[PDB]
């Protein structure tokens, strides 16, 4: 009766009504606070991400074998019971699996027999008394696993994680305000290509990072770094393509960081940088750049040296003008220059026809120059311009802008 | 039964029509004087700021997982109990919490477990016997707290904020008539960009603001500042841009304010200043010169030098005649001349173009000159004036202004 009642509640039409899409552009179905799982939700073969958030008394029948695109199982606070045929079906179609748990209470037990999945996520405190990282010891049978992401406020680095991570490609560690004691134990983690350390509050770069030649992305967001004096030891690495020291308090970025030519993306926004040196911009292949919410008083010289870029983020600092330094760049596509004290836009920004966006959320512009009327490519929806600032353009130019918005 | 009935009566569509927007342009919902909290409120997805006011002893359901856009929890006299999955969700989502309480036991004890919280508004007395800042001694667990509003009648500033202020970026303390013994304890608090000491009855500017260096917005509202002679040292503060010395007992301005070239908004309104020294008029960066409700009898001509001035509010002053040099500054956007003794407004206001709202009602203005219609952006809503004063304009110029009201 319970299953029949919930079947009458959630018909296929209401399921298509509740169907959404996630950040991975996969079909998601947010099922939250249901006494039981439906059967029509397993009838729909279109489903790709089966979401089970806080649904108690879960017992999945083999009609989950009816699912075709099932590669994601977002079970949150869910105790899942799966029969052997449905478990074997999961052993050939399931690929990604996210778990939200309150310690051992909400951790499924059938995940260890799964040997063909490729992605997995975990979230929930693990460093309990007398159970120091002892609940995650059964993840050794998983050989095809490739992606493992953890947010489990770890007070210490688990040795089980170091043993497990041999077959790992992407690993992100979030401690949400807790010390991470790497203690040079990441030297074994040679296969890592992306290392994210979000809110590890390190205040020092561990020496084990300088040993991995596969890392292209290094992420130290919200680590409260003030003085980066460990980038001199980063010179040994020749794989880091993008450093991420953003949402920190880095007062100044030293000179030696200009020796990293392989760097292509600098995310240093919301920092304490006062003057960024010109020698730092000797690396002209900085395709992405994030320098917003900073204390830059002027845009320095060797931005003119930069040529292989696509955006600069200059939001919320003390820069007054677009100098010829930004004007020697011929590939910029997005300008994040809002809420600034930018006095004027000089003429050559009206040659920048390939201008996807501008950000001007409170900037001190006198008026948009007529050179911006030289580019019909930038449309009213394309750029972000204040209404009082936008109206100063000529009526022919404004009509062309609204036309290109329609056209 | 009351909780279930409240879930039943507060339907979804009536909540949709109950939705409003705040000053921060976020979707809003004010729950005032209810038995509990409806679950259909928690079924909402577009809501951003929910406002819990006078809610007696309710428990937060985990259905807050639906409230993904929820970022500001407003707690007014609400003793809230919390479910563990909802506690985790608010730990990972909720970012702004305002707590008003009458008793120091009314503040929830799970607010310390929040980790994504940055804005805290503890309004209500934290100072009590053996509970004087010992209850909020758990804000050491708070890590990303940047805005800490304290309308709490603090006799002396806590040691806990001296511990926390390394990461704090705004300290709004309202004692409603209790003097701070600051004791230069803000030296360890180095990351403040804004300091709003309002209604503190300081009667003098302390030296803790002077020891700091990162401040850009300094408000000393209603501090009973009789003398402000210390501002000579304010050149040490190279980043200040808004010196809100309003609502005080300031009777004069020392000439060393001319050293403060970095000021952009100088809010001296509702003070006892009777003469503006010309040295104050040296600062070219002033944009919001609000000297309203003061004892000024004349306006110096050097106001024409202040080209960046936009909103000159001299409302309710003793200024009898506006000098022509006042209209030298072409950036005047809102000339608040109301409640003054202006005998006649010169025709040079026709040269101004940025003027959007001029206030002349309540003056000794004999008649409105024709050149006032020369301002393009001025409209009837902007041109607030007595109806007979409006009738003095030519019916063709009056047609132009009435059309600006229409078109």
């Amino acid at each position: 009766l319970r299953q029949l009642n919930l079947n009458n509640e959630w018909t296929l039409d209401k399921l298509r009504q509740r169907l959404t899409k996630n950040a991975q552009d996969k079909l998601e179905l947010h099922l939250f606070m249901l006494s039981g799982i439906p059967d029509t939700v397993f009838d729909l073969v279109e489903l790709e991400v089966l979401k089970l958030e806080l649904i108690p008394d879960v017992t999945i029948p083999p009609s989950i074998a009816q699912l075709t695109g099932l590669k994601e199982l977002w079970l949150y606070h869910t105790a899942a019971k799966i029969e052997a045929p449905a478990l074997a079906f999961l052993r050939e179609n399931l690929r990604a699996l996210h778990i939200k748990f309150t310690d051992i209470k909400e951790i499924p037990l059938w995940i260890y027999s799964l040997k063909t999945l490729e992605e997995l996520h975990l979230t929930g405190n693990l460093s309990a008394e007398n159970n120091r990282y002892i609940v995650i010891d059964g993840l050794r049978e998983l050989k095809r696993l490739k992606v493992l992401r953890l947010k489990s406020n770890l007070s210490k680095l688990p040795q089980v994680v170091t043993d497990v991570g041999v077959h790992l490609q992407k690993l992100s560690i979030n401690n949400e305000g807790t010390k991470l004691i790497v203690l040079n134990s990441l030297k074994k983690m040679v296969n890592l290509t992306e290392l994210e350390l979000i809110r590890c509050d390190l205040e020092r770069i561990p020496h084990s990072i300088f040993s991995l030649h596969n890392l292209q992305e290094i992420d130290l967001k919200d680590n409260n770094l003030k003085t980066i004096e460990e980038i001199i030891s980063f010179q040994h690495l020749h794989r880091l393509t993008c450093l991420k020291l953003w949402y920190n308090h880095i007062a100044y970025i030293p000179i030696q960081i200009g020796n990293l030519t392989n760097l292509e993306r600098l995310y240093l926004n919301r920092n304490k940088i006062e003057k960024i040196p010109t020698q730092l911009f000797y690396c002209r292949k900085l395709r992405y750049l994030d320098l917003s919410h900073n204390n830059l008083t002027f845009l320095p010289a060797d931005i003119g040296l930069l040529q292989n870029l696509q955006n600069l983020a200059v939001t919320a600092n003390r820069i007054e003008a677009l100098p010829p330094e930004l004007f020697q760049c011929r590939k910029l596509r997005a300008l994040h220059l809002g809420n600034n004290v930018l006095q004027s836009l000089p003429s050559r920004v009206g040659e920048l026809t390939n201008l996807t966006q501008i950000e001007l959320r409170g900037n001190r512009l006198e008026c948009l120059p007529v050179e911006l009327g030289e580019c019909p490519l930038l449309k009213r929806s394309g750029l972000v311009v204040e209404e009082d600032l936008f109206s100063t353009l000529p009526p022919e130019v404004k009509e062309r802008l609204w036309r290109a918005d329609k056209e | 039964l009351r909780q279930l009935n409240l879930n039943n009566e507060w339907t979804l569509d009536k909540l949709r029509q109950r939705l409003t927007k705040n000053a921060q342009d976020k979707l809003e919902l004010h729950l005032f004087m209810l038995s509990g909290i409806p679950d259909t409120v928690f079924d909402l997805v577009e809501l951003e700021v929910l406002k819990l006011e006078l809610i007696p002893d309710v428990t937060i359901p985990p259905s807050i997982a639906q409230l993904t856009g929820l970022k500001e929890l407003w707690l007014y006299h609400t003793a809230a109990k919390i479910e563990a999955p909802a506690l985790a969700f608010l730990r990972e989502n909720l970012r702004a919490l305002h707590i008003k309480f009458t008793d120091i036991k009314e503040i929830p004890l799970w607010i310390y477990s929040l980790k994504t919280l940055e804005e805290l508004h503890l309004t209500g007395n934290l100072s009590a016997e053996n509970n004087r800042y010992i209850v909020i001694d758990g804000l050491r667990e708070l890590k990303r707290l940047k805005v800490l509003r304290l309308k709490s009648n603090l006799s002396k500033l806590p040691q806990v904020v001296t511990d926390v202020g390394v990461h704090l970026q705004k300290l709004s303390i309202n004692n409603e008539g209790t003097k701070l013994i600051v004791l230069n304890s803000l030296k360890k608090m180095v990351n403040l960009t804004e300091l709003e000491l309002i209604r503190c009855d300081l009667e003098r500017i302390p030296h803790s603001i002077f020891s700091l260096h990162n401040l850009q917005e300094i408000d000393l509202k209603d501090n009973n500042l009789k003398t402000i002679e210390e501002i000579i040292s304010f050149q040490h503060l190279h980043r200040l841009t808004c010196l809100k010395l309003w609502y005080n007992h300031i009777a004069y301005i020392p000439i060393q304010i001319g050293n403060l070239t970095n000021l952009e908004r100088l809010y001296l309104n509702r003070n006892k200043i009777e003469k503006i020294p010309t040295q104050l008029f040296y600062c070219r960066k002033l944009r919001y010169l609000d000297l309203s409700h003061n004892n000024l009898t004349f306006l110096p001509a050097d106001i024409g030098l202040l080209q960046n001035l936009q909103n000159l509010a001299v409302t309710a002053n003793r200024i009898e005649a506006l000098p022509p040099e006042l209209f030298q500054c072409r950036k005047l956007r809102a000339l608040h001349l109301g409640n003054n003794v202006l005998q006649s407004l010169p025709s040079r206001v026709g040269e101004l173009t940025n003027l959007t709202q001029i206030e002349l009602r309540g003056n000794r203005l004999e008649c409105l000159p024709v050149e006032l219609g020369e301002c393009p952006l001025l409209k009837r809503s902007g041109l607030v004036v007595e109806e007979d004063l409006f009738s003095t304009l030519p019916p063709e110029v009056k047609e132009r202004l009435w059309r600006a009201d229409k078109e």
Binding site: - | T20, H30, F32, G338, N339, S347, E359, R361, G362, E366, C367, P369, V370, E371, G373, E374, V384, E386, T392, P394, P395, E396, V397, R400
Partner: protein
């Protein structure tokens, strides 16, 4: 229970969205068609005024103490009561009042108990038993009352006005067709500066108005004045600069106006004057001279003395001949000659460097001369001319005033 239903009905959000501004540039709540005041009014502490329109038997609580910004009340047909501490707070805070009394009870006796009152607007319908109003005679309690606008049938001037002889600065009556008598009270004005007797049914200038010694602005609008004759003592009103005598039946202005050498604002529009005198033009201090819609036949050539005249509205009059002496005065900024009886316009107009207003609508003209381009301060929006005569102008002359 009505108060409870009022609190339930009018949430503070509804009163916040009701908020607007009044005619005095104050934050005013226009509470209209209600049973009483809600208790959620006082949660809006930033309020500066309340408009109570037809809300009778209202009892104001002490929670009005939260309205620190409050400085004005506007009671429209409201028989309102107040509580003792609220009475003390509004005694120590309020500055402006405006009470209308369609019925006598709608005028409250409590409102005179304040002492911080500055401005009062006593609109309504007062009974002819004016001296019996002891509620009126309580304005002596007000130690700062400067504005007193009584829009009611004030036949006999109260001794309440006597008791506020010094502190008053603006005195306004709209008597609405009743003769203003008992002149000794208006004789007792000592420091009054603005006397606004609008339609006091004055068959001439009262001797009380002329016994004023510190007047600065006198308005006798809609008062059927017969003559201006006693002016040998207007010389004691050296403080007077504003004479407002339009919408009247005056037919002549004698030489006696030479007594006041501080007169700036002169109003004589819509009057029965058939010929403007030259001895009126003998005074040169006069900067504002209003004579619109009059019956003036011609302007004597003595108007050249009136150099400081910045306003000479002769529009909609009977004037057929305009002398060249008026065009000698270059300070005339606001000049309206619309709907007059002129034939041609004077070519010599270019000496008027400061000339913003020119209105010639309705008046018969043959050809607009090119000399209209000679005016420097003239504007196309300021030069109100028909579209047909807008066509009859050279393109350069068109652009001279059209292009800003």
């Amino acid at each position: 229970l009505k108060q409870l239903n009022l609190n339930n009905e009018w949430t503070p959000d509804k009163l916040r969205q009701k908020l607007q501004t009044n005619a005095h540039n104050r934050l005013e709540l226009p509470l209209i068609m209600l049973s009483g005041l809600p208790d959620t009014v006082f949660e809006i502490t930033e309020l500066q005024s309340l408009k109570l329109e037809i809300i009778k038997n209202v009892m104001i609580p002490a929670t009005i103490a939260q309205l620190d910004n409050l400085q004005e009340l506007c009671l429209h047909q409201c028989s309102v009561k107040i509580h003792s501490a609220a009475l003390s707070f509004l005694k120590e805070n309020l500055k402006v009042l405006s009470v209308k009394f369609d019925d006598m009870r709608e005028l409250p006796p409590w409102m005179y108990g304040l002492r911080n009152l500055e401005e009062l607007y006593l609109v309504g319908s007062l009974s002819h038993d004016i001296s019996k109003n002891v509620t009126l005679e309580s304005l002596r309690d007000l130690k700062s009352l400067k504005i007193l606008s009584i829009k009611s049938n004030v036949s006999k001037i109260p001794q309440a006005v006597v008791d506020v002889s010094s502190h008053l600065q603006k005195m306004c009556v709209h008597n609405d067709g009743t003769k203003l008598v008992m002149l000794n009270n208006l004789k007792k004005m000592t420091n009054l500066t603005e006397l606004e007797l609008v339609h006091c049914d004055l068959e001439r200038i009262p001797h009380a108005v002329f016994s004023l010694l510190s007047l600065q602005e006198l308005d006798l609008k809609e008062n059927n004045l017969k003559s201006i004759e006693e002016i040998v003592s207007f010389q004691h009103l050296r403080k007077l600069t504003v004479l407002k005598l339009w919408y009247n039946s005056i037919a002549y202005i004698p030489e006696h106006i030479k007594k006041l050498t501080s007169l700036e604002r002169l109003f004589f529009s819509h009057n029965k004057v058939e010929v403007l005198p030259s001895h009126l033009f003998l005074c040169n201090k006069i900067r504002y001279l209003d004579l619109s819609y009059n019956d003036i036949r011609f302007i004597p050539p003595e108007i050249g003395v009136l150099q400081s005249l910045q306003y000479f509205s002769i529009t909609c009059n009977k004037v057929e001949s305009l002398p060249d002496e008026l065009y000698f005065c270059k300070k005339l900024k606001t000049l309206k000659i619309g709907k007059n009886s002129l034939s041609v316009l004077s070519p010599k107009i270019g000496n008027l460097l400061f000339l913003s207003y020119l209105d010639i609508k309705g008046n018969h003209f043959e050809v607009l001369p090119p000399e209209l381009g000679d005016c420097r301060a003239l504007k196309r929006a300021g030069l109100v001319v028909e579209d047909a005569l807008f066509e009859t102008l050279p393109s350069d002359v068109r652009e001279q005033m059209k292009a800003d």
